[PDB]
Subunit: 239 residues, 6 copies
């Protein structure tokens, strides 16, 4: 038995750096820690949601899984900003796309995310609350990719509660308004950062084209991940 600072995290207060990368898959958090962090230690194991704290090029940085969907990321991110006093979270993830000019393996930097969730209406008296990335975070990601000579798409994501969509007309509307990424979490992250006066952003790589059916192979997903994670890590040095 270990003391629980939250119901979902065994990390002691202070065990997270002020900057955190989060991905849905805890096993990918372990890969990031093992391959890009120094001075690294595991700080959470509860529910298998592995989290780690170390340094990247000398600067404190943590990485942790967030699970799948808005309710899951909301738990972990609320706790990080509130209990662990985190200042900046960058979600690093994968996505689909419907946009005719976005392609599998593209890196997408998210400026804002729509959603079919109610969580943001509940925060703003039932109205439209845009889940919006912090501009300094977006800019740090854009500038890092430029320095690395990695092309990026910059624009809106759509965070759905329903991976297995049965919704006629959704993809056509997303394409009409040039949503570049379809995922399940960023729309929950950004308003929590707002609540705490903190910062958040998101960068994702396109695994699948929802319209054309193109799909990245395992090796292509690894290469896309290597590009995206390097962009995110370099961006943390400016944040």
């Amino acid at each position: 038995h270990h003391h629980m600072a939250t119901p979902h995290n065994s990390a002691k207060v202070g065990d997270f750096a002020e900057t955190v990368l989060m991905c849905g898959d805890p096993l990918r958090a372990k890969l990031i820690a093992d391959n890009y962090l120094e001075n690294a230690k595991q700080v959470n194991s509860v529910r298998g949601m592995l989290g780690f704290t170390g340094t990247y090029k000398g600067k404190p940085l943590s990485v942790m899984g967030h699970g799948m969907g808005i309710p899951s990321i909301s738990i972990y991110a609320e706790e990080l900003y509130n209990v662990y006093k985190v200042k900046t979270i960058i979600r690093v993830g994968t996505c689909g796309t419907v946009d005719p000019n976005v392609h599998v393996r593209d890196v997408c930097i998210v400026t804002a995310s729509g959603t079919d969730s109610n969580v943001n209406r509940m925060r703003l008296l039932g109205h439209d609350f845009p889940a919006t990335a912090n501009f300094e975070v977006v800019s740090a990601l854009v500038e890092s990719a430029k320095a690395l000579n990695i092309p990026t798409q910059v624009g809106k994501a759509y965070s759905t509660d329903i991976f297995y969509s049965k919704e006629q007309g959704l993809n056509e509307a997303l394409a009409q308004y040039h949503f570049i990424a379809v995922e399940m979490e960023s729309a929950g992250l950004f308003p929590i950062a707002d609540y705490y006066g903190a910062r958040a952003g998101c960068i994702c790589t396109v695994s699948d084209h929802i319209i054309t059916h193109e799909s990245a192979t395992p090796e292509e997903r690894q290469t896309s991940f290597q590009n995206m994670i390097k962009i995110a890590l370099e961006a943390t040095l400016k944040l």
Copy 2:
């Protein structure tokens, strides 16, 4: 590299029994498999969402984690009913309560679950779709608890997208209408079972009283879990 029957599950088709217990914590799925299943093998490890298949008293039974929140359980349960041809899922979990006559450590058998999610409105043209447990599953749980001489509360749950509620008046309304359990998943499970012509139910133990602040100790949670899991396992023999 192993073949992926779904993006979230490495189990081969046929590797799940027709009856599955699901809990949010994959580490608890491992505990259930290790302590109550025979002939057991691990069938999924993707994203750390451990799943296992074996037998309970000779009858095929699987157990797998579902993560936290409606979007997460919806992925895993949709795949189980669709790809893995599962017929019955019983969610085994923990919950809070606001009801003045429900107490920490009580076992709650869920007949239906409300929610603040939009996922069920999207299935029924925007209207009210009650997430309803299958009657044979509810009855099997009730009868199993009676045979084990374990008291149970039977009634409505509320599945929220937001663990860290800031919503004035919610607890008072839940208490006024005698919702017995507050959790985050059952309202997503029951309509998916309906879609596939299959069966689902839920049983949970009260970890915390949201109004009085009472909270079960670690040992009390283990004892509550032992009672609940025995009820669920015995119920599978009738399903």
Copy 3:
């Protein structure tokens, strides 16, 4: 002029038994009283909404009409639970079906009911509140039918505000999720029972198949009614 305990009911306080059967048609309430109750007297005549109190096999039991639609049943049931101190109401009625495996003359026992009404959103801060039958009532109906060797369908109803639907896609969605009964009242009854800490359920017979156009003849409806009413009356002895 007689004293009015409510605006809609001339019955004196105490004139209703603790258990009440309700049907939409007051003339059917009279038929039930005349043919199944002993010690019977008429206790309400206001607005022609006939109600009666007597005994069934020695146990106090009332029967009263509720009119058509959620607003009408809500008036009468609110008054019965509040002013008349009723503990259990079973709605006995007729319904349509869209389910491919439910047939005209089938008896349907309702576990929960969806709706296109707003009345339940208004009770739960705008969220999804499942109108859910009390489990002891459902079980009493199921067990009574078993003892009488009368087959039953057990599952969800849909209570609509609009008998003359013009809504494209509604029947297809109801069938997809295996709603077994289409009626106009149960979704209003169950939450009122919850408010008063009381019990409610519903049993109905299929008069019409909405998809195939099959329709029960007058004699077939009488036979279906005889089966359903015997199930309900026998269930009251266990409640």
Copy 4:
């Protein structure tokens, strides 16, 4: 057994006049027929919802009950306009008021009615559809009252699904915007008339002041009814 032109009305096609008065209480429909119609016959008895056809000052006129709430009036009025080819319906009823300048026993002529029902959103793609009385009907009622030297209030009603309101702030908002009548049916009637290219209106007498608690005695309600019904009957001669 008699032939049923609708499920809810035994009247033969042609048995209703082109102009119909409707009130919620079928016993009040009988009173109107017995005391104001000549050449009168009963044309419906189904569900006790008495309806009658005769003449008023030589002009064909019917009167029938509509029950309580939007779903109930919608059934009866849809059938009258569709199957029975009715051209004009005037609802004659009772109401409460919250307006500080409207008093018990006042006669209210309704120009439009708000509602907490969804039935009108479902007709207009989810938008705001005002349930609006036909201007010729409103004018006929206003002019008839003037000729009879009976004062009237003219303005908005609010048709609620919930007689037993628990809704904080509703009465204050209704008063702020000068809603003059609170009832349960007119918002369902007016859009059905629109659908059929037909005409509808409503006139009501104030039985109760919801804010001040004033309430009309039985004799006062009879006098108010006599004034209102004379206005409505005289208006039919101009319609």
Copy 5:
């Protein structure tokens, strides 16, 4: 620099008559003042939203532009009723029609207006609040047109936020329920008049048939305007 009684109006308190005509185009307000008012002076120039006060046949009358859309008219009308103590506003405007029996150049007198705006839900606890014209204003317009031997259509308008509609099925629904006018402002005006215990109405001429594509020429629009404005001006003498 001049003193600003509101942020949007340089008129001094008292500079508006108690009766005001409003049209969307400020240049049309100038035309009305120049051609129909005596004793006229310009009282507002802010944002180019020209307004004027004078007399029509000796009776004080003002005319001012309101801009396009509900938010714009709401600003100007709120200020007129609140700060300038106006008692009656008649909107004079142009509209489209979808109704099969309404034709280009027809004069439409509005009894109530639907909308796709949220502004009226926000006033009535989320419910349906009909934007309803004052009956004395409607009657004054109807009677004035009769005296001038100018035919009129009397009925519902629809005030949309979106001139360039992309909404499948909207026109068909508007036609089904006999909405006679499509415009962008009246649904915002009527509830503001209600709030202040004041009066409002609307009269419009059909510029375009949305279904048949017929369109009035410039000269035809001038003739339609001459008919409509004479009706409105004569109506002010009765208000």
Copy 6:
């Protein structure tokens, strides 16, 4: 009579530059043209909504008024992107603030805007569609202000339909989530730019603090405008 390329704009096709500044007040559009454009000509006068085309530092640039509210800007911007083939619109405006760390006279660069309008739900199947500024436009504004040594706040706006708010709790929620600007138009502009594959942004100066009641004097508003307009004009050179 002049030919009308749209119902609201007399400009000939080609008469607008590919880059346009828009402000609500047409008289302010004239001031911008008169004081910052060369080669300038007036291209629209319809409804007094003055628009002009010229050059800024040699680069083609137009400026036009947009009126007040989402419906008004939607008309003008839809036409500019569609008929006039405009590629970039920057809204230049004024706003209020509720944020405790934003002050009167501050320049706010908008990354996204929330709203109480329905126009964006209607574009995305009823879901949350974030009205999001184009990143290149935001960056051009940020970089221009940096080069001019003018401090800026960068973050979310809220576009309301209701200038005269009566909404309890709105300001507290806006402050809790650090909305920096309250205005009435940007949430309508950004999705129209998306539809056309074009670009939009917004920059505003704080005229009033809604919480503290501080208010900029006329001279202070002129100085704030001079700073903001110089930022916007310099940004057009990079777009």
